Enzyme design. Structure first.
Site, mmCIF file in Angstrom:
data_model
loop_
_atom_site.group_PDB
_atom_site.id
_atom_site.type_symbol
_atom_site.label_atom_id
_atom_site.label_comp_id
_atom_site.label_asym_id
_atom_site.label_seq_id
_atom_site.Cartn_x
_atom_site.Cartn_y
_atom_site.Cartn_z
ATOM 1 N N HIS F 18 22.766 14.400 66.782
ATOM 2 C CA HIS F 18 23.238 15.194 67.939
ATOM 3 C C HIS F 18 24.223 16.279 67.491
ATOM 4 O O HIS F 18 24.136 17.415 67.966
ATOM 5 C CB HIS F 18 23.965 14.279 68.941
ATOM 6 C CG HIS F 18 23.096 13.213 69.551
ATOM 7 N ND1 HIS F 18 23.542 11.904 69.677
ATOM 8 C CD2 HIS F 18 21.830 13.292 70.025
ATOM 9 C CE1 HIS F 18 22.544 11.235 70.235
ATOM 10 N NE2 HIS F 18 21.486 12.024 70.452
ATOM 11 N N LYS F 42 19.131 3.365 82.428
ATOM 12 C CA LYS F 42 19.115 2.912 81.038
ATOM 13 C C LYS F 42 20.137 1.817 80.731
ATOM 14 O O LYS F 42 19.903 1.038 79.803
ATOM 15 C CB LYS F 42 19.308 4.102 80.078
ATOM 16 N N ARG F 91 12.595 15.547 66.799
ATOM 17 C CA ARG F 91 12.546 14.787 65.544
ATOM 18 C C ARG F 91 11.138 14.525 65.031
ATOM 19 O O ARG F 91 10.890 14.727 63.839
ATOM 20 C CB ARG F 91 13.333 13.470 65.633
ATOM 21 C CG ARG F 91 14.820 13.627 65.954
ATOM 22 C CD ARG F 91 15.478 12.281 66.221
ATOM 23 N NE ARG F 91 14.761 11.474 67.216
ATOM 24 C CZ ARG F 91 15.341 10.796 68.202
ATOM 25 N NH1 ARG F 91 16.661 10.816 68.344
ATOM 26 N NH2 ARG F 91 14.606 10.093 69.054
ATOM 27 N N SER F 129 19.907 7.052 68.847
ATOM 28 C CA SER F 129 21.041 6.254 69.305
ATOM 29 C C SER F 129 20.573 4.798 69.496
ATOM 30 O O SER F 129 21.294 3.858 69.143
ATOM 31 C CB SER F 129 21.569 6.793 70.629
ATOM 32 O OG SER F 129 22.352 7.958 70.435
#
Ligand SMILES: Oc1cccc2nc(C(F)(F)F)[nH]c12
Ligand SMILES: Oc1cccc2nc(C(F)(F)F)[nH]c12
Ligand SMILES: Oc1cccc2nc(C(F)(F)F)[nH]c12
Ligand SMILES: Oc1cccc2nc(C(F)(F)F)[nH]c12
Ligand SMILES: Oc1cccc2nc(C(F)(F)F)[nH]c12
Ligand SMILES: Oc1cccc2nc(C(F)(F)F)[nH]c12
Lengths: 158, 158, 160, 160, 158, 160
Positions: F18, F42, F91, F129
């Site tokens: 990040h 979440k 990514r 994460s």
């Protein structure tokens, strides 16, 4: 009377292709196995050789008609009175290009529905290109091809 | 005594390839780095040049044997008494074709186990093709190639 | 080289796909530890004792397989088991992305552990324990995907 | 050939993407059953009665569509409905991997059922019921992705 | 003054490319639409023809400069004082190669930031290659190309 | 052009991946809002105040970064912040499919917002994460993937 076209280069036709066309004859009344001339692909077999091999390979299937074409496949499908366009879906890499071709064909002929069939696990990892490569190196490809095709590929490479 | 084959075109061998073969020597007793002639790929370097470059690049690794072959890789692996076939897995696109090749090789030689190794993050985005393209445009590729290979690629393009 | 390899997973339950992978691993490595994760976060259908007993029975014909449970990070277990090879079964593209993330993380955690990807038979290339359980829960026939002992235990589990 | 086809899903709620797929299926198959899963595991926003009523209203202009609920395995329902064609909408790569797993499992369960993949309009190729619900829950405009009756029911649901 | 380069073969430039360059001019002060000579791709149109077609297609966009190059694109971006390199992202297959090119360019010029823009759904399934294939078969491609490009492609194939 | 860009996410916790993305964004855009989602669905490890404080400390050396929390739809926030650029870190293939769905939805919601995809260093191209938290929860070493302040807060969180 529902008419489907199954277009491709079929250089040469494999058991994977036989699997797809057979599934198509169980779903639709008439299936046209349509062989594209595909000169840009520099095919191993001439269009006439590919037509003869496919005719002989699918002769056991009564509702299969084999024809060659150099036309745009959307025009050929219109001219064959087809409303269904069959393509086999092996894996992710094919799928990406299949979406482009199907969206293009939809722009050219909106009433022609592209449908995808999934081959058996048995033929899910083969292609004409892969079979030709093994055969160029004298590897056994009898399992992946109809008898007449296997014989013709042996002859061509000898 | 466990014998593994690491086949490929290696046109030319890169640090990515060096990474994979090194990981293979830490796992298996003897590793054969096997260079396919691959004429269909129209390689930049001849088979003999690729063999010499790879020999010089892997000379620091005692259990690496470099050999060229025009045979079917499954027959070559059988003839080398190999029971393990190493391939590097960089990304999704390679993986799809790797499955086809491994399922084909399994049909040709069932006792030959295809194993995949993952390169370091450092070499995860390079290929012989990409390195040659940068080098055709005089871009610096010293970071991606063994010294002898870098020198040979400079020479070839001059 | 007298290689110790680990084949970790939840094995909830162990399938013919897992049996195929562990059989291939025993052909190339001297000792294979089939390591069963406690896996609390996922909430397994079978308890760890049930999962271990099933994998034991289903791999008993493989002389160089050891079935063991673990609750630590799979790298911490591998390190303490003196394993230098980490077996991962590779079926298709979707899992491959997570496989590379897992393999790079395992390399950071334990550099001396090497991730090796094995390919199952075409026969088991399109199944998972997840899909098998879902089919079985919804009254579908999964006999073909499981060892006989696993098939028996799964029917008993779903009946109650 | 007088073909019976099934188009199963959760349809929570039915979107313009689903309407596009079921419309294409009616053009090539004599009878299309739009089959709505009870789908307990997912915990749907709309009840099965609400989902069935919405799909009924949104497909009423299609004479050869039958909206039906089901709670069995989608192969067990297809078999009992005498369907020989299983319609699956194909949007992109990510779902395709699961689609092949589902299609091979359905082939094992019911060989006489053929999975057919249809492609939606580019217009609906990047949406899902999941994404539509998430946007709507977070005060975003989803009018464009839904039949008018579905749009009305969704606002009423989110208001309370 | 932020300067971005949008490199590619543009053989020929499509509405997909026009969409990306337009999005780039709304984000950056000056956009260089950079046409690679790309002889390895055996392009249909010469570099000079591709430059003229792109110039005419983007003439309505005031902050677009069209230029041809045979250089390494990282050196060309440095020489154009660009700090942003634009690439369009249609699907997964392109993305894989885009990561390799961007990681390579990052090694060659670290201060050059590769940014990816997403085309409209309208152009998400087309490519220069696909348009040329339909056009080789006399299929209607007017929808996918600027007027001048469509005319030039008709001429080239006649 | 005096561009305002937003870089939204859950940042639970903020990683070096990040930091790499937000640093690249500050090099090409005049003002970058690092926007932290409340993200109830979440169930985050760190509270929004903890997530905001961590991102603030970890980006303090970047003069044109503003750390802000938000609970609305990410397009509604971008609109009210007068942002015309939406930063997304890219990514690998798996996320890309969802990225295109998100980007087409954001384009429908706010046409004047342009989605831009930035690529992180090879160093952070295989982490998330999610994976970092999982490793840390299971007693693995994640020091290398986090800012020092985040590393300190994560150990304190897991200890209790
Ligand atoms: O109808 C078509 C749409 C898109 C591409 C196409 N390529 C052909 C041909 F090569 F002739 F088979 N027909 C196409
Ligand atoms: O064993 C093989 C299986 C599949 C393809 C193959 N192509 C070769 C060769 F080109 F010789 F390297 N060997 C193959
Ligand atoms: O070694 C590992 C690397 C990355 C993630 C991991 N999750 C586990 C565990 F769940 F504990 F088995 N082990 C991991
Ligand atoms: O026929 C099926 C094959 C594989 C998985 C499946 N899950 C269902 C159900 F959820 F019940 F609709 N049907 C399935
Ligand atoms: O900067 C580059 C990086 C990687 C590959 C490249 N290929 C070119 C060229 F062909 F010149 F356009 N430039 C490259
Ligand atoms: O703007 C958005 C587009 C699509 C989905 C979205 N979910 C969010 C939220 F969770 F609120 F941050 N914003 C979204």
């Amino acid at each position: 009377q529902k008419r489907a076209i199954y277009p491709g280069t079929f250089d040469p036709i494999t058991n994977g292709h036989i699997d797809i066309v057979t599934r198509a004859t169980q779903m639709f009344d008439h299936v046209i196995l349509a062989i594209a001339a595909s000169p840009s692909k520099k095919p191993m077999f001439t269009l006439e050789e590919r037509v003869a091999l496919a005719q002989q390979a699918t002769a056991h299937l009564g509702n299969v008609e084999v024809v060659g074409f150099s036309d745009l496949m959307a025009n050929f499908a219109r001219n064959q009175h087809a409303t269904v366009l069959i393509r086999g879906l092996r894996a992710v890499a094919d799928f990406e290009y299949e979406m482009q071709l199907a969206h293009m064909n939809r722009h050219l002929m909106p009433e022609l529905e592209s449908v995808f069939l999934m081959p058996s696990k048995e033929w899910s990892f083969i292609s004409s290109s892969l079979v030709k490569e093994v055969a160029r190196h004298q590897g056994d490809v009898t399992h992946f091809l109809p008898e007449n095709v296997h014989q013709a590929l042996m002859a061509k490479l000898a």
